[PDB]
Design an enzyme around this catalytic site. Structure first.
Site, short mmCIF file in Angstrom:
data_model
loop_
_atom_site.label_atom_id
_atom_site.label_comp_id
_atom_site.label_asym_id
_atom_site.label_seq_id
_atom_site.Cartn_x
_atom_site.Cartn_y
_atom_site.Cartn_z
N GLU A 131 -7.26 0.60 -4.52
CA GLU A 131 -7.29 0.48 -3.06
C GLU A 131 -8.62 -0.06 -2.52
O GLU A 131 -8.62 -0.95 -1.67
CB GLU A 131 -6.91 1.82 -2.42
CG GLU A 131 -5.42 2.08 -2.45
CD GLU A 131 -5.07 3.55 -2.31
OE1 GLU A 131 -5.88 4.33 -1.78
OE2 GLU A 131 -3.96 3.92 -2.75
N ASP A 136 0.90 -1.14 0.00
CA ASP A 136 0.00 0.00 0.00
C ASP A 136 0.94 1.18 0.00
O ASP A 136 1.60 1.44 1.00
CB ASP A 136 -0.85 0.03 1.28
CG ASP A 136 -1.59 1.36 1.48
OD1 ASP A 136 -1.71 2.18 0.56
OD2 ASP A 136 -2.09 1.59 2.58
N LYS A 176 2.70 11.46 -3.72
CA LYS A 176 1.57 10.81 -4.37
C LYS A 176 0.66 11.85 -5.01
O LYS A 176 -0.07 11.55 -5.95
CB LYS A 176 0.81 9.94 -3.37
CG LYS A 176 -0.27 9.07 -4.00
CD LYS A 176 -0.59 7.90 -3.11
CE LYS A 176 -1.82 7.15 -3.56
NZ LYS A 176 -2.06 5.98 -2.68
N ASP A 208 -12.97 5.22 3.37
CA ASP A 208 -11.54 5.35 3.62
C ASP A 208 -11.14 6.75 4.06
O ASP A 208 -11.03 7.66 3.24
CB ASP A 208 -10.81 4.97 2.34
CG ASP A 208 -9.31 4.83 2.52
OD1 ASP A 208 -8.80 5.04 3.64
OD2 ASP A 208 -8.65 4.48 1.53
N1 LIG Z 1 -5.75 5.13 16.65
C1 LIG Z 1 -5.86 6.10 15.78
N2 LIG Z 1 -6.79 7.05 15.98
C2 LIG Z 1 -6.84 8.04 15.11
N3 LIG Z 1 -6.10 8.28 14.03
C3 LIG Z 1 -5.19 7.30 13.86
C4 LIG Z 1 -5.01 6.21 14.65
N4 LIG Z 1 -3.99 5.41 14.15
C5 LIG Z 1 -3.59 6.05 13.09
N5 LIG Z 1 -4.29 7.22 12.86
C6 LIG Z 1 -4.19 8.26 11.82
O1 LIG Z 1 -4.35 7.67 10.54
C7 LIG Z 1 -3.73 8.58 9.60
C8 LIG Z 1 -2.89 7.72 8.66
O2 LIG Z 1 -3.82 6.95 7.88
P1 LIG Z 1 -3.42 5.86 6.87
O3 LIG Z 1 -4.70 5.31 6.38
O4 LIG Z 1 -2.46 4.97 7.45
O5 LIG Z 1 -2.75 6.71 5.69
P2 LIG Z 1 -2.93 7.03 4.18
O6 LIG Z 1 -4.09 7.91 4.09
O7 LIG Z 1 -1.67 7.74 3.89
O8 LIG Z 1 -2.96 5.72 3.47
C9 LIG Z 1 -2.93 9.65 10.39
O9 LIG Z 1 -3.75 10.84 10.23
C10 LIG Z 1 -2.85 9.00 11.81
O10 LIG Z 1 -2.90 10.00 12.85
MG LIG Z 2 -4.78 4.89 2.35
NA NA Z 3 -6.06 8.09 2.50
NA NA Z 4 -1.74 3.85 3.68
#
Ligand SMILES: Nc1ncnc2c1ncn2[C@@H]1O[C@H](COP(=O)(O)OP(=O)(O)O)[C@@H](O)[C@H]1O
Ligand SMILES: [Mg+2]
Ligand code: NA
Ligand code: NA
Length: 382
Positions: free
Chosen positions: A173, A8, A69, A197
């Site tokens: 995704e 990912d 990205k 998402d």
């Molecule tokens: N327990 C949690 N509660 C709230 N936000 C969280 C938690 N764990 C991770 N995050 C948040 O998730 C986000 C990252 O999301 P992710 O889906 O991994 O990324 P992306 O959008 O880059 O794929 C960040 O904003 C991080 O603070």
């Molecule tokens: Mg993502």
């Molecule tokens: Na995202």
């Molecule tokens: Na991600």
């Protein structure tokens, strides 16, 4: 041979998994984290990738690159690029119409195409997998947003090739997330799935219709500039105000103070998804004043109330475009780190009149998980 992996490649966080023995394994990195920031930094002596990169952004802002990205497979003259770069601390230059990130590495000024930056992150995921498997990784399945056009996907595939990765396939995704929950199995009927998402900087809502193992993205909506970072900023602005009350000082001008407070808030936010309050302990925030305080879940929720609630607008748009009613969607799966927030889960569940949410798989690992299963089948490993 070696196992094929699923990666990912996210806007803020990336994740890698491997299917083995009928089970998927989400591989933790050097720091033991199951996802790693899509950050790259350049210093006098080295190139930092991942946690090591994010762990110094407040000190090296102009040479720490992120959000690649958002540039990948896009033109410089693109309105998107023009708008976005107004908020990046690093330089974006035009090169024959293509945008390049300009940084200073080891004293020398250098530039990279967005696909080169993403390949660095891609290399980090690869070595992370190799360190775990104890064998070289070559084949991989990388994911991409459903709305990516041919150029963006081409560029993603290229970032993979320069990273030494043989990209077996590029899949969406939302589809990867559905596969993770086994919603791709044939049940002799049409199934409508909603992928909600909410990540770090992006929000994507996708409605997939699956029939006989074939996916059809019936509708998509969301917000390209809404995610966990916006929730952090609300806490920051809130604490900036509190500091002004207690110590009558405005730390706003100090870039280092703000970034350190932001890091503290992001961590407090994660704690709030499992606890009702969290403490912010920052030594010598401004001048020599230590900022010791705390927030409650209740306060966190009201600071972001409008943002959390607005999260449903794109859900309604998605529905109407797909020409479906709430009662017609059969499965709802949570994706993205921000879906771990209790209020978000309540809001969505309330909107769908009490429907159960698919969330047993860490939302921020769901995409990589789905891609790893797909990588296995495409290699006959499954
Ligand atoms: N327990 C949690 N509660 C709230 N936000 C969280 C938690 N764990 C991770 N995050 C948040 O998730 C986000 C990252 O999301 P992710 O889906 O991994 O990324 P992306 O959008 O880059 O794929 C960040 O904003 C991080 O603070
Ligand atoms: Mg993502
Ligand atoms: Na995202
Ligand atoms: Na991600």
């Amino acid at each position: 041979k070696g196992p094929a992996v699923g990666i990912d490649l996210g806007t803020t966080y990336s994740c890698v998994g491997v299917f083995q023995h009928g089970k998927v394994e989400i591989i933790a990195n050097d720091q033991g984290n199951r996802t790693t920031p899509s950050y790259v930094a350049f210093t006098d002596t080295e190139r930092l990738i991942g946690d090591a990169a994010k762990n110094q952004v407040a000190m090296n802002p102009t040479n720490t690159v992120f959000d690649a990205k958002r540039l990948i497979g896009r033109r410089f003259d693109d309105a998107v690029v023009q708008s976005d770069m107004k908020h990046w601390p690093f330089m974006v230059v035009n090169d024959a119409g293509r945008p390049k990130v300009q940084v200073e590495y080891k004293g020398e000024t250098k530039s990279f195409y967005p696909e080169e930056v993403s390949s660095m992150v891609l290399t980090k995921m690869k070595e992370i997998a190799e360190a775990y498997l104890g064998k070289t990784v070559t084949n991989a399945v990388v994911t991409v947003p459903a709305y990516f056009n041919d150029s963006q996907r081409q560029a993603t595939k290229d970032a993979g090739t320069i990273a030494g990765l043989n990209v077996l396939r590029i899949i969406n995704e939302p589809t990867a997330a559905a596969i993770a929950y086994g919603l791709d199995k044939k049940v002799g009927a049409e199934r409508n799935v909603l992928i909600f998402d909410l990540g770090g900087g992006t929000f994507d809502v996708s409605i997939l219709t699956i029939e006989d193992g074939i996916f059809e993205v019936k509708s998509t909506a969301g917000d390209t500039h809404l995610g966990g970072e916006d929730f952090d900023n609300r806490m920051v602005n809130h604490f900036i105000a509190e500091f002004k009350r207690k110590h009558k000082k405005d730390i706003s001008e100090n870039k280092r103070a703000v970034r350190r407070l932001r890091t503290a808030c992001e961590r407090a936010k994660r704690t709030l998804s499992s606890s009702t309050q969290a403490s912010i302990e920052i030594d010598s925030l401004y001048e020599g004043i230590d900022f010791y305080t705390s927030i409650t879940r209740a306060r966190f929720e009201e600071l972001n109330a409008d943002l959390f609630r607005g999260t449903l607008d794109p859900v309604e748009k998605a529905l109407r475009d797909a020409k479906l009613d709430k009662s017609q969607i059969h499965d709802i799966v949570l994706v993205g780190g921000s879906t771990r927030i209790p209020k978000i889960q309540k809001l969505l569940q309330d909107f769908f009149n009490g429907k159960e949410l698919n969330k047993s798989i860490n939302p921020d690992e769901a995409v990589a998980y789905g891609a790893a299963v797909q990588a296995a089948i495409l290699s006959g490993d499954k």
